[PDB]
Amino acid sequence: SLTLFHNPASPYVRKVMVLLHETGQLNRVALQASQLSPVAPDAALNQDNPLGKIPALRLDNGQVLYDSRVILDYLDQQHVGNPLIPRDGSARWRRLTLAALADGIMDASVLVRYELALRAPEKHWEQWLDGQRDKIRRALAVLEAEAIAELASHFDIAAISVACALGYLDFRHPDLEWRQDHPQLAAWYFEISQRPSMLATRPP
Amino acid sequence: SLTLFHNPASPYVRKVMVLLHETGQLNRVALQASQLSPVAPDAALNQDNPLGKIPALRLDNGQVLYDSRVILDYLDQQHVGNPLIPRDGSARWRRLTLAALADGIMDASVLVRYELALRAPEKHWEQWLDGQRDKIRRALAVLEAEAIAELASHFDIAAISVACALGYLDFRHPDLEWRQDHPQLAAWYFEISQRPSMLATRPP
Ligand SMILES: N[C@@H](CCC(=O)N[C@@H](CS(=O)O)C(=O)NCC(=O)O)C(=O)O
């Protein structure tokens, strides 16, 4: 069977968990708990993913896949349902670009979390923090437009990725109050939060 | 024709350029010079690229793709013959994981560069910087121990990504010596550095 390095905070892990739920493949995956940060290595994880990041997926044959987008691609090709990642043509490119937009939000969000929670306050750099927050805000604006119609078309790779990014803002960055100025996105997210796969994968 | 939002220092742009050379698709592309935004997002927007993604690829009919991994997939699917990303088989996820290893080297390398170059010295956090350097070192060790034959077998998505990551280490982090403990990787890099795709795309 498969083994996924996991913890319930990670929104990248959450993408994987949501895809597993949606595709009926939770039964294939043992969870290996990991607590970690860039200054607190997990030695067991590092033996499998030298980058020291989660998610990482150990296959039945012992090979390891990372990062999250590689794992999601692998898992999407294992089931016979409709794919969550379009296999060809225009949709493939469009939906993977929205997924990358969402990953960029997560990347900035995690960096701001680590600076605020781990770095000594006297070493915080406010202009850096605000630059990351502004990159998140600009991406949210594009998502507001996408929430008009494109986002809701399918609960697929793009929708999962965006949903996990918004859930992570709620969890670690409520001060960004993303709903206040993004009502269309707020409505979309309120709906997709009720999906069983989202309810089962919320952070602590 | 296509437009690539381009910067010559970025190793992520470099992967795209190398793949365009290697697949014979430079005759498709016009470059549009674009400024990296390490701290505050750029105040000058191109309306097709409101998030200032670099690389970003604007298709013949105006859709814009990003990030580099999405662009690489798109471009690889636009030519016939030998794909540089395997379409299926164990090799697909093996080569994509090796590419992700390389992207992780680049990610750690950029974080270290931007902190060292842009953040005030008194606010540098050495244990954080070393945690990122340790990702790089562990990843190099995996390449040397596990990936030499793989890299040599095909100058593909994995090899291009690794090559660009090593070029970026030489460019921004020559203090991080990597050739001594990874002699096979060093020899391979010396060889592939002479490919026209690599010579043409070296950072300034
Ligand atoms: N490109 C990767 C990013 C994973 C990541 O940053 N994960 C964080 C945990 S966070 O999501 O809770 C992680 O592993 N941090 C540890 C570290 O950076 O040392 C992916 O898409 O899987």
| CATH classification of the domain holding B107 | 1.20.1050.10
From CA A150, how far away is CA A95, in angstroms rounded?
A: 9
Among A51, A63, A90, the residue with its CB nearest the CB of B101 is A51
What CATH number has the domain bearing residue A59? 3.40.30.10
- Could you tell me if A74 and A99 lie in one domain? no
Q: Do B146 and B63 belong together in one domain?
A: no
Its domain, for residue A13, covers 1-83+196-204
- B132 and A CB contact within 8 Å: yes
Chain A residues with beta carbon closer than 8 angstroms to that of B51: 101, 104, 135, 138-139, 142
Token duo for residue A178: 């993303």
Chain A residues 56-85 with a CB less than 8 Å from chain B:
63-67, 69-70, 73-74, 77
With a CB cutoff of 8 Å and minimum separation 6, the contacts of B38 are A131, B114, B118
Checking chain B for breaks where C and the next N are over 2.5 Å apart, the residues before them are none
Nearest residue to A23 (alpha-carbon basis) of A82, A71, A70? A82
> How many Cβ atoms are within 10 Å of A161's Cβ, its own excluded?
28
CA torsion, ordered A40, B113, A109, B44, to nearest 10 deg: 180
Strands A64-65 and B29-33: unpaired
Neighbours of B75 (CB within 10 A): 23
Q: What are phi and psi of B183, to 5 degrees?
A: -70, -35
B168 annotated as belonging to a binding site for a ligand:
no
* Resolution, expressed in angstroms to one decimal: 1.1
Cβ-defined contact of B97 to A41 (cutoff 8 Å)? no
Q: How many angstroms away from the CA of A109 is the closest CA of chain B?
A: 14
Q: Facing residues of B197 across strands?
A: none
Residues A114 and A92 reside in one and the same domain: yes
B33 and B65 inside one domain: yes
> What's the token pair of residue A95?
């939906």
Rounded CA-CA distance B162/B83 in Å is 17
Q: Check whether residue A78 and residue A98 sit in a common domain.
A: no
Q: Does B167 lie in the same domain as B105? A: yes
- Same domain? For A104 and A163 the reply is yes
Ligand 1 site residues, Cβ closer than 6 angstroms: A 9-12, 36-38, 52-55, 67-69, 110
Same domain assignment for residues B204 and B118: no
Q: Which residues of B touch A37 (CB under 8 A)?
A: 131
